[PDB]
C-alpha cells in the first residue's frame, strides 16, 4: 500500500497548476481571520494554520525532489501574501495584518530550521550528489532571504497603514477633543492592536515595537498641529491636553508598557508649558529645564502663541526679548525647523530581533470549513504514511 500512497502524492505535487490555484484562492485569498478578541480562545493551530499547511506541502515537495515545483509554488505564495497585506483596508487592517505577520514568521521559522538542518546534519550531504547539495543549500538560502524580506515588507506596509488610520483620528482627538473623534476612539484603536497580538500568540516584543512606533507618531503629528495653532494655546487648553495624554499614559501602564511616557514627551512638555508660570525671567529658566525635549525656537514659537485669558496678565516684553535672546545664541552654535519629522518609515522588522520559533514537529491538521480538495488529500496521505 505504501507504494500506491507515495505514487498518489507525487501526482498531486507535480501538478502545481491545481495546487497553486487552491492555495492562492482558497487559502491565501480565501483566508478567514478568526475573531480577534479573547472572548473565544485561539490555540496556535488556529492562528498559523495556513503556514502549517504550506510547510507540509513544501516538505513533501522537497522530499520527492520536486525542486522545480516547490520553487514556483513559494514564489507565488510570497507574491500573494504581500498582495493581500497591501490590499488591506478598513476594519480588517489590524486583525488580518497581524494574522499574516504570525504566519510569515511561522514560515520563516521553518526555512531557518531547514537551512540549519541541511548544513549541520551530514545525512543530507552524504545522501545526495555534490551538485544536488549545492542546489538545495542555495535553494533554501534564497528562500530564507525572500521570507525575511517578506516579513520586513508586509510589516512596513501594515505599519504605514496603521499610521494613516491614526492621523485621521489622532489629531482631532488629542488637540481638539475635550472631556469628530474622541480619546475613547484612540484608546479603542490601541485596544484593538493589543487584543489582536495577544489572541494571535504574537511575541510581546512586536507589540512593544508597534505601539512605540505609533506613539512617537501621535506625539509628532499632534505637536506639529499645536505649534501652528493660533488663538488656541490657553491654560485651560493645556490642562485639557494633559488629561488626554494622561489617558494614553494610563493605557500604556495597564497594558505592559513602561516607555509610553518617553514616547509622548513633546506633548507632555507642551501641556506643562501651557500651565506653568511664565511671568518673570526666573520662570523661563525653570521652563527650559522641564521642557528638555523642546528647542529654543520651539519654546519661542509656543510661548508667543499663548492664549492669555480675560483675567490673566500678558507676558512682559522683557520676557519675550529674553527668550529671543536665547534663540540668538543657539543658532550661532550650529555654524533648523520648529516641527518634528515623524518617522514614516522604513521601519526595522521587530520579528528580526527575536529568535526564530524553535520548530517542532507539526500535527497534520486542516480546518473543516476550508475547501481545498488536493491540499487536504496530501495532508491526509502523509498522516497515514507517518503511522506506517
Amino acid at each position: 500500500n505504501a507504494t500506491q500512497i507515495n505514487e498518489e502524492l507525487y501526482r498531486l505535487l507535480e501538478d502545481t497548476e491545481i495546487l497553486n490555484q487552491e492555495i492562492t484562492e482558497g487559502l491565501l485569498k480565501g483566508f478567514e481571520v478568526p475573531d480577534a478578541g479573547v472572548a473565544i480562545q485561539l490555540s496556535k493551530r488556529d492562528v498559523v494554520y495556513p503556514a502549517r499547511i504550506l510547510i507540509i506541502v513544501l516538505s513533501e515537495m522537497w522530499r520527492f525532489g520536486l525542486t522545480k515545483q516547490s520553487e514556483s509554488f513559494l514564489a507565488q505564495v510570497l507574491t500573494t501574501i504581500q498582495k493581500v497585506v497591501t490590499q488591506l483596508k478598513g476594519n480588517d487592517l489590524i486583525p488580518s495584518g497581524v494574522f499574516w505577520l504570525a504566519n510569515v514568521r511561522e514560515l520563516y521559522s521553518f526555512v531557518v530550521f531547514a537551512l540549519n538542518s541541511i548544513l549541520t546534519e551530514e545525512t543530507f550531504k552524504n545522501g545526495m550528489t555534490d551538485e544536488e547539495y549545492k542546489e538545495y543549500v542555495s535553494l533554501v538560502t534564497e528562500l530564507k532571504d525572500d521570507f525575511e524580506a517578506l516579513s520586513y515588507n508586509i510589516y512596513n506596509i501594515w505599519l504605514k497603514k496603521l499610521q494613516k488610520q491614526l492621523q485621521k483620528k489622532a489629531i482631532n482627538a488629542v488637540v481638539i477633543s475635550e472631556s469628530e473623534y474622541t480619546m475613547d476612539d484612540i484608546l479603542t484603536f490601541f485596544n484593538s492592536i493589543y487584543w489582536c497580538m495577544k489572541s494571535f500568540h504574537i511575541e510581546n516584543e512586536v507589540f512593544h515595537a508597534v505601539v512605540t512606533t505609533l506613539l512617537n507618531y501621535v506625539d509628532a503629528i499632534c505637536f506639529n498641529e499645536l505649534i501652528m495653532k493660533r488663538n488656541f494655546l490657553s491654560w485651560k487648553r493645556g490642562l485639557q491636553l494633559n488629561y488626554n495624554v494622561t489617558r494614553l499614559e494610563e493605557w500604556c501602564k495597564t497594558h505592559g508598557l513602561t516607555d509610553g511616557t518617553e514616547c509622548l514627551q513633546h506633548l507632555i512638555q507642551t501641556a506643562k508649558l501651557l500651565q506653568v508660570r511664565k511671568y518673570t525671567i526666573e520662570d523661563i529658566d525653570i521652563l527650559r529645564g522641564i521642557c528638555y525635549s523642546l528647542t529654543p525656537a520651539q519654546l519661542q514659537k509656543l510661548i508667543s502663541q499663548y492664549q492669555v485669558a480675560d483675567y490673566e496678565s500678558p507676558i512682559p516684553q522683557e520676557i519675550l526679548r529674553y527668550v529671543a535672546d536665547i534663540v540668538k545664541k543657539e543658532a550661532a552654535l550650529s555654524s533648523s525647523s520648529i516641527f518634528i519629522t515623524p518617522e514614516t518609515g522604513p521601519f526595522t522588522d521587530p520579528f528580526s530581533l527575536i529568535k526564530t520559533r524553535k520548530f517542532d514537529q507539526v500535527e497534520a491538521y486542516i480546518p473543516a470549513w476550508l475547501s481545498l480538495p488536493s491540499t487536504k488529500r496530501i495532508v491526509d496521505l502523509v498522516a497515514q504514511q507517518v503511522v506506517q
Binding site: 538542518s117 545526495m128 497534520a364 502523509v382
Partner: peptide
C-alpha cells in the same frame, strides 16, 4: 534523491 525532513507527529 530528494531532501527529507522529519516535521510531522
Amino acid at each position: 534523491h530528494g531532501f527529507h525532513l522529519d516535521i510531522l507527529k
